[model samples]
Target: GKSKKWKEILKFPHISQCEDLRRTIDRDYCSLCDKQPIGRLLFRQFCETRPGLECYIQFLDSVAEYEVTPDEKLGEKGKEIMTKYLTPKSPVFIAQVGQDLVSQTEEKLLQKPCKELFSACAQSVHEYLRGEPFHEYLDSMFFDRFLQWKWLERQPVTKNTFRQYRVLGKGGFGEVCACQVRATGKMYACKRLEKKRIKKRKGESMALNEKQILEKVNSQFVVNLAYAYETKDALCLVLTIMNGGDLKFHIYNMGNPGFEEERALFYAAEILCGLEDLHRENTVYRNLKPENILLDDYGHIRISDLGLAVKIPEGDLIRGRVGTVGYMAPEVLNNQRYGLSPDYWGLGCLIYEMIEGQSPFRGRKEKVKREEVDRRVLETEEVYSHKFSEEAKSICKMLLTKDAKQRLGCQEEGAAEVKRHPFFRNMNFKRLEAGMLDPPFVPDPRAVYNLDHTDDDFYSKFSTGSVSIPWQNEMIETECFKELNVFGPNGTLPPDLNRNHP
Candidate 1:
């Protein structure tokens, strides 16, 4: 009956009582605290009265700035928190707190506070509100207006809007360039897929799918799509700018023994998190390789290209010959049924190359030929070098196993199983997922990773493009592009465009 009241108040369904819900709330709470301290403060107010919802927020916040605060200020803040949250029968008092905690608070109200404070109650109110009610309220109270205010006030984006800078790379149809949004002076990687090329290659479906998937995924480990628009000749995706070179460059150009075990492990851990996120979204990152993995200025990695990624139904295996030859798993080489494990296989290949300086199937200086790499993938066993640690060998061996079902990450628990292996035992995955841990290397911000910057020749050949302004308007109106300007639009877009605004 109370659950029904919660539904009525929120105009949503009842929340489920499950460990998953609790964990989800905890994650959201932490993420909010990390991203927006103001939001965290508001969120705390609503959840403070709930039981078992301790004031870990204060501890985390204090720890973050503890070095800068004087002892007196720290004590005052501690006393304030104790009076407001820890002690019973006080304003913002946590429910079911015992006399022991109250006494403890009274004793230490002015002294240095403990690193953590616990509430004895059984459940957190925000745990339930964090479910549907708060989300429902958030959508109505902030999101709708947030969309109209930000997106509707501005003109839709276009290729003409960007000041194209250095050529990043070439894709299936056109070139990727580091471009600046002329209005905001913000930099982004502009991926332009030529319209004629997509039609010629019969890649219309694939091109659309790539845009759709990019719109769906939002992970720090994956490159973020900032804007999607089109010119007369091409479809453009404005994405996060990763100035550091790709993993390919680092593996080959850094010279010598490739990356140290520590560095390689850090990379593998991040890539695994990205791959796992994709898998959780029911997406198979059919292509996973050093070239498609880009390093940010901080040297943290993000999985880049998504052109070959495909979504599959739960428990259903997909059949297709996809991925690079050396990174291809056996099942994919045979065009056999497979799931997401092939991505793991590619990850194994990636790890090997990162540490060993060569693919397991093909050594350095190998010549490419018909089906040579494919044959190795389908029939060969990878030979581990003495350089591999026992943990490294174990993970790569299991991940590179020919049988998809026997693959390290292919079981029911999926990524969790891979994450638990001895190879990743030393990884602080929680910090890794939150992007809190410092990367093993930080690329020099002043340096340009792309040595041969401008491909002026290519751009001059393809310069015949147009500004179909209405197309920009029409594109964002589509289902796929609804959440386009999430960073802007508090109600700033054109008034006419807001009539049917999302």
Candidate 2:
């Protein structure tokens, strides 16, 4: 009786009754859903069984009934929908939808709710699902062939298959380590979250959220996820390794006088590009700081550690107070409803630190208290030192404005507004985005910048010694890795595939 409601609603389209919709999601689908990979498995199965229809089903699942309401009531509904899906307790509790399209649709619905509110949201979702790009991706012949080849070529990734190296750092759930895949001999940063710790801390949704976000992102400025799989004890996410280390090391630890103006400009430009790409993907990178920005051997920068990042679909202002202390925007600290402006504010703080050798909120030789920092962020005026050029000061001032509306890059033009500022007027953004421009500061490839303990302290010591587990092979047969089909360079489109597309 419970299982038949969504199908019933779909077969006979009308205004959704809120309580009935909630009952179907809660009573029926919640029983079928799990806190882990079961949802991914089910979605993959649905997609393979029926390509275009599954997308429609997913859209339908996230909807609820709400008659004509005022702006405040609509806002309440927006929060309601987002929270419902964000909770692991709900069947449609997939983080990606609430983080992206729902927010977008919520705004559109509020703007034009004369009638057929459901149809407006559904049309937005439908156009997104049925757009030209979606079809091209779905109907690719090479993609279909490559999918089969990938399954045939690789074994189900497990902890035993990797030669664990030095411990990189401690993650939220477990240790992150540098590891080499035995089959491919390629290096990656293996971020492992222990299942026990995840369950204990009620972090199942957060863990799943990170995995889903990582899967969707395909940007050069962000760290690319190579593979994701589960070991008995942990959920393993294999990501591109950035050996050159984080920007914090280079800023605070790489000798005196921090970075030169040219170097700071170079890094700021690259970082901006990274943020731009993330925004294009409907993601708000809530936590941006020197520590999260990593440099590569080639001196390029990529934003890492996406745990706090969220997708802010069209027209929705995110309302969470999350980010680093010194870098958090005034609006964010105030806990006001805001959009990408806070990130621009954080970027402003970053630019200040780069040129001035410390955050604007901090004194040169004095350690400011967190309370003092908040006061300075909210109340005090930022005085530019002799280090600031007129253009730099102008840009930073605009970005760090107390009023988010007047803040640089907060408008519809987005990153383009920041790009055209006098500070970066001469920089060729096209070259920077393409990775064609040479960075002013190049890191030493031989050295590990954030060295702590060695392999003796943290690398997994167990020797599998060419022994393959029976369950891993069985997982392969059942297509357990349908969501994780792409591996290594295959994650990128082949040159041949690209040639035929255009």
Candidate 3:
């Protein structure tokens, strides 16, 4: 029976119950002067309006300046929406505009005279008479933001709206490039996979599967996909730009070869949060490596690449082997059915590499010695030594257990069981989860983009130019891409108008 956003939009006392509205209207209906458009509001007046609002109509002005043509019968359409929202069976209602929201509150207002909810009532009436949408004066400020949503506004992203940049990482699966939104001048990493290559691998479903998984994933510690769309011969996934580059660049490729215990702990703690979210959703990430982790503008860690991830129903086992050489679990190599334990094993290998600056199995080899798998998986205690703390060594031992049941996260509680370990005991897990923990590394003040950690040889290959496809030419858009999408073709706007950019 209340509305928080309604109150915010009103900027004064707001209505909740229909009784409050009726009683307020009876006492203080919208007066002639109250509904009139006041001329030339001062700077203070503009500042007084709440977020997501603008100047409203006062009755004094007779003139109208049309920007876009008025929608036909918008007032008649609005009346239905206005009354429909007001008379909702559940008192409170939800209002949506693009990605914006105004949730209902558990508060109401009906106490004063001339302060009724319909101060805008006469304004709406004035707009209706002027043959203008009420939106021409002010948006429908009356909106409810509380409760579950049946649907959300989906922005139909396509290359017609973006410009692709240099190829960053290329592989058999796909290639990644830096991209920018022409409308916002904002940057993102776009992973483009050749449909021909996908079809050749008979992995069309696999490509679609990762796209679906990326859509469902939202994590502070993971590079979540914001947009994924199909092009003529390719599939493009728009993602958060890890401007600081990958951990391979930061950890080993850069001049800084060894990651101190404190720095490594910070990254490990963040990855734990990412793992918790994935496991909680019944997904297992089998790929955990320095190459798969990237850094944000702040140099904070974000795990990437879920190509090897699988959704394992709790208690049931899954087959089909997938993973990198050194990061592959013993069970994966043995061709045995496995649960979520494989991910823990992979984490153990990654953690060891972080501490020792090399894989334990072969000292510093990129390719795994398959024969050592039996020893490393079953004998975690014997392989790792004094380079790491006793607690750190214990962490590897706990997670790298040969038997699935003995693994750190193999228990019923899963990742939570690993959180209780001594490795992450020094830091406040809550602060890390909320992204409040101060990271050991921060991007340099002068460097807007940090590729300092990327290997120089690899950087030369990626810094050439924008992506080029022989079959690609002019861009086209669908109906949904034309309208429902927030970004338009008009890219140039004054600085103050650049609300879409970061």
Instruction: Provide TM-scores for the models.
Output: 0.69, 0.61, 0.59
Please list the C-alpha lDDT of all candidates, in the order they appear: 0.65, 0.64, 0.55
CA lDDT for candidate 1: 0.65
Which scores higher on TM-score, 1 or 2?
A: 1
Task: Estimate, for each residue in 139-187, the C-alpha lDDT of model 3 and write its tens digit.
Answer: 2121110000001111234576578878867766789898875544456
Best candidate per TM-score, number?
Answer: 1
Backbone clashes in model 2, listed as residue pairs: 104-314
How high is the lDDT of residue 233 in model 1?
72
Q: lDDT: which candidate is best?
A: 1
Q: What is the per-residue lDDT of model 1 for residues 1-502, given as tens digits with 9 covering 90 to 100?
A: 1222322221211122122333433345334432332334334533443344445334334434433334446665556555665555655455444566566556654455542322212124335445654454343323333223223223455565668888887866788988875534556788988766766676666776776677667677888676777667776877778988899988888746478777899999999988887887889998988889999988899999998999888878899887776777888888888888789899889888888999888888888774887787778788987778999999998989889888898888988998999999888676677677789889998986711223333333333232222223223333212333222254343332233442
lDDT tens per residue, model 2, 330-349 = 88899998888888998898
**Model 1 RMSD, rounded to 1 decimal:** 12.9
User: Could you arrange the candidates by TM-score from highest to lowest?
Assistant: 1, 2, 3
Minimal lDDT window, size 10, model 3? 143-152
RMSD of each: 12.9, 17.7, 18.7
- Full candidate order by lDDT, most accurate first: 1, 2, 3
